Design a binder for this molecule. Structure first.
Ligand SMILES: [Zn+2]
Ligand SMILES: [Zn+2]
Lengths: 357, 357
DNA sequence: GACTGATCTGTACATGA
DNA sequence: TCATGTACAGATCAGTC
DNA sequence: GACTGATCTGTACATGA
DNA sequence: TCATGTACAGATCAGTC
């Protein structure tokens, strides 16, 4: 039933091999340039994130997320209002001439300036690539990335995400977040929150004050770890352990939403991170690996489905790391959208999921 | 029944507090001196091991194990025969004048010279302690340590173990060892074997060739990790998880052996590491946390007990990290001892464990 | 500007209810 | 079984050369 | 003598039986 | 469901300034 859908969604190792070849080449060139010519993004490091690197990419390997993170010492964050997600970045110490002085709009590190220079460098190096059909995509509003289109005959999109790495303790807005204590445990959560955190440009085009100096938190590293260490049992999905159907449900849900989005313009507010967040909450709700046995696929997928609908009905999907940040607020998504989606989803749920063809 | 015995074996937080106070003071002074006066053990670091730091110490806090580990780059090991446990230590690179040149008997690092200088320094600093009654114990044959007796009114013994730290990949004799793949998992084992390993002086007084240049492997770091991360479930014994009776069975077994040893001279070959190794094998055999529920204490303790007897009957207790190394060989322990122990143990097992009074 | 001691956060354990 | 206090452990921050 | 590229081991995943 | 081959990831070692 659903197993056949999962077969359809499976990536093919040939496609994977070629796409990965080309992609790795381009990425390596860009990183190296970002170090080489006496840049100010020298010292940047690489961190692969997203569905492809979590092995939850569906249909095709045509989307890649790569973080160019740069450690930026001695900073102080001023929370942008009480959003929990958004911050203004200040420095204690302008070191001397300082790489990042040119990226200052006061005491405040400007996300848009930094992003513009980043973009300029990337375009420059991309012009010098003669053996691969790679180009720079026009800037998308609300993106912290420079998106590359690769004609590896087939089209592949690569988000090169500019990030700031901070080894300090996580902002307060996350203190109640990451509620894995009953699922992955206390030692795990403690070790994860000991890790650095990351800030990417918000790059909203709304016309606000502090619009180009607003940064958003990112936890793609931690999400990667969770996707790859997802059981209560350490042997879950391991070589000497047993498979769950967690990743599978994430894939099915992702696909459902992708299709429902390609057919309806009413769902342009929705992205797969909503699905991911919701499923994090579900995995925290049903921690037991037994509650995610393959033989219970259909029911498991329904459980999640049910949960999601409730999130729409209550208009309440809390951010998994920032509990005060609601993702289904009226400010971000209109009621009408959520209701429309509840309708379509319910239909599909009561009709044997016709859309899966 | 056994719960009351575990109550008797429990340490008391006052005793713990005082003993720990004094002990930490002395240890800090010794480490600092080991760094300060222009030594050759400068750069040494501390690593607390053993029952006290695993929270499996029984009766009293009168025994402490502390490793002074020193990273020793660019070495090559020659396995002492096919023992798997014993090695001769050679250098690729005599760096220049080199700290450790004085500890060389050729190309071979001498364990006894190093241990002698270590001991000399420790005695020197111990003379300078005026506020605490601390002395150096006479060297024990087969010890890689300098043992301190502290009259903190009550007597406390502290083994200061000289160790060498190597970040290279683990010797081949351990390749089949650490068989946690079904219990803690594959990722765990892989990450643990990526860690450094340690060599302590064998310090046998047997009169062999290469007697004072023979080193023994140590895995007290890994054993510490296992004791503190002992479940298949990450929440085992955690604040938002459930208790097992693993540590409890280790304690009971430890105590049984301690008593049976204090009463009988026939069991001077036996140490608690045999108990620890056996229980590692049992935890690998019964990985499920459900197989270690508190309510199944008595039976669990019996299971272990049974296992141990079999190890004596077969005269086969493999080292947990070095599978080729047998601990119940005739070379190390006489049959008569193992049989005697089987007898006493069986008696206790069939008689409601009178010895526990 | 770089190295060492001081401070802070949280887990495991004892204790009291 | 559930709340309160101590040790241990690791990490970050503040102070000295 | 210090920094970067090359080599090696193992987990997760696709494929074939 | 179980054996074979590819990507990804981290670590150590060898080669260049
Ligand atoms: Zn799983
Ligand atoms: Zn446990």
């Amino acid at each position: 039933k659903l197993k056949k859908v999962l077969d359809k969604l499976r990536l093919k190792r040939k496609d994977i091999s070629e796409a990965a070849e080309t992609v790795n080449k381009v990425v390596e060139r860009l990183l190296r340039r970002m170090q080489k010519r006496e840049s100010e993004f020298k010292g940047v490091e690489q961190l692969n994130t997203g569905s492809y690197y979590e092995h939850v990419k569906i249909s095709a390997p045509n989307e890649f997320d790569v973080m160019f993170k740069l450690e930026v010492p001695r900073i102080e964050l001023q929370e942008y209002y009480e959003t929990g997600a958004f911050y203004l970045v200040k420095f204690k110490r302008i070191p001397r001439g300082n790489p990042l002085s040119h990226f200052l709009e006061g005491e405040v590190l400007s996300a848009t300036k930094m992003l513009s220079k980043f973009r300029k460098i990337i375009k420059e190096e991309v012009k010098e690539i003669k053996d691969i059909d790679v180009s720079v995509e026009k800037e998308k509003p609300g993106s912290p990335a420079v998106t590359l289109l690769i004609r590896n005959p087939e089209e592949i999109s690569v988000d090169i995400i500019l990030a700031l790495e901070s080894k300090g303790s996580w902002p307060i807005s996350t203190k109640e977040g990451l509620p894995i204590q009953g699922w992955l445990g206390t030692k795990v959560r403690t070790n994860l929150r000991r890790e650095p955190f990351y800030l990417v440009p918000k790059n909203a085009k709304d016309g606000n004050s502090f619009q180009g100096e607003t940064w958003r938190l990112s936890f793609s590293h931690t999400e990667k770890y969770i996707l790859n260490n997802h059981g209560i049992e350490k042997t879950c999905c391991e070589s000497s352990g047993a498979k769950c159907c967690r990743k599978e449900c994430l894939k099915l849900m992702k696909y459902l939403l992708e299709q429902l989005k390609k057919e309806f313009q009413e769902l342009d507010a929705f992205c797969s991170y909503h699905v991911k967040t919701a499923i994090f909450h579900m995995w925290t709700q049903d921690p037991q690996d037994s509650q995610w046995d393959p033989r219970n696929l259909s029911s498991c997928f329904d459980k999640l489905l049910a949960f999601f609908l409730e999130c729409l009905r209550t208009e309440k999907l809390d951010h998994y790391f920032i509990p005060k940040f609601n993702l289904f607020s009226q400010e971000l998504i209109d009621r009408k959208s959520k209701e429309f989606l509840s309708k379509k989803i319910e239909y599909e749920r009561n009709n044997g999921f016709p859309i899966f063809d």
